[model samples]
Target: NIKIFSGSSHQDLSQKIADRLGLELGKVVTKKFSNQETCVEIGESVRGEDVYIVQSGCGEINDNLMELLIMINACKIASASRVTAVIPCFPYARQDKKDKSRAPISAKLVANMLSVAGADHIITMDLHASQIQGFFDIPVDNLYAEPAVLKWIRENISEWRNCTIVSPDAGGAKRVTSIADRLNVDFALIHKERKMVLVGDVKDRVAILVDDMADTCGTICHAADKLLSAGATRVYAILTHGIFSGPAISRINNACFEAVVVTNTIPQEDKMKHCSKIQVIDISMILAEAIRRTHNGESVSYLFSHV
Candidate 1:
């Protein structure tokens, strides 16, 4: 048996996942006080069942985190066999490490909080740092968005003969290279000479910028300018999360990329409304299948194992 539940983060994505799995919505009630204090109430019994709760910390980070923790505690107290926190878009993930001394690693702190809160397992997508998996004691399956991306790219770009997968930064080469290799294309590395992530690398090729996420247009816009100057024929960006915070929409609106492709991890109304280059690819079935496999005692990695 499979049970899927959704928090306020991305209900439509969760519902789509459940729909693909042919499962009913798990019983859950979440409310907030006037002061915005979160309260969670699991209405149905999950006794002896493998429970999977879909709660990605999309917006209102603190409240979603609290709501997820409370939901796990409720499942544990209700005698559920196991509980998995399905956090597709992890909160405070970019802070996985302390770039400067004396800085606190909020990502590690979040991991500690979850462990202390009685979570048995975790399932997240495209963490900023792959090593963040070491922060938790329980099993974590960090699924890559490449499979879906590769599938889409192959189906879309008919003449990839001149296509090159562009790593927006030196650190992203491995990921961009993987995509390039699968697509049988060339690859280029974008180098930043200044504070911008995309300053000096455009030299007349069709650049396909690849990264995990883009919160502000600084990184992407910087690269697009550099690529264009370096002779790049065109510029495009592909990332998993669209955490387009303050002024992000307007910034992207002024960007130079040919297009920006992101998954529906966090719903973006502005992308649809303002940015014509913004294209969203739904991954609800991917999460849903992973949840079903986990509940049935199967490996979640198998979702992308074929690639």
Candidate 2:
């Protein structure tokens, strides 16, 4: 038997995953107590059952994370066979201190906390850095959305035939090359700090900007301005994670572009309400498929290439 539970972080996405997987939600309770500590209770006894907890690192990250650990503790004490964490998005944090020489390391302690919590496996997507895999003590797999994105480009963008894939920095050089080759088109990338993530082009072609995430909109807006100024007929930005923070909405609203497309990795309900240029690409379809594959004995990489 399998038990599916969700943290307050992303209940709707978890519910969607359960619905797609033809599963039911486990009765659970989590909230802040009067002392400001997060408390969680698992009503279902998961004795010898396969357990999966859906908790993407979003909204009150600390509370959701503590709540997840507590749920895991309860399930383990009751003797569950296994508990997998479905962290569709990484804690937006937990990692990445390399930029500073003396800054504290993260994702290490974060993963260690999970290790102690008894999570047997971790299922996440597009884990950007290769070396970070070593951070987890348990089995970990990073899924990709290339095929789904390719489909969107082919079907959604009417002028994709005349578009050039654009990457802002050197890291995505290989990613852009592969995508360009697949489409039989050329790709352009900048060395760094990148206004021209749009490639300083626009004489009569459609430009497609591909980036893993966009936060402040400074880079994105800069690129769009240059693309339009250089005479590009149209521009479309596709981002995997849209962490639109601060005045990002205002920037995007004032900017010129065909549409800013982002995956539903994080809830966009709040931002979409204020910005018309924003559009969200559904990702539950791919995530649900991965969960099903993992639940069975099948390999998930089978889907990395297939649409």
The C-alpha stretches of model 2 lying farther than 4 A from their native spots are 34-36, 191-203
For candidate 2, the 10 contiguous residues with the lowest summed lDDT are 192-201
**Candidate 2 lDDT over residue span 45-75, tens digit each:** 8999888888753656777777778887788
For 182-238, candidate 1 gives per-residue lDDT tens digits of: 887788787676534443334555778888988876878887787777788888888
List TM-scores for all candidates, in order.
0.92, 0.90
Q: What is the lDDT of residue 203 in candidate 1?
A: 56
Query: CA lDDT of 170 in candidate 2?
Result: 71
> Worst 10-residue stretch by lDDT in candidate 1?
194-203
Q: What is the C-alpha lDDT of each candidate?
A: 0.79, 0.77
**C-alpha root-mean-square deviation, each candidate:** 2.2, 2.5
State residue 295's C-alpha deviation in candidate 2, in Å. 1.7
Cα lDDT for residue 256, model 1?
83
lDDT, model 1, position 108: 91
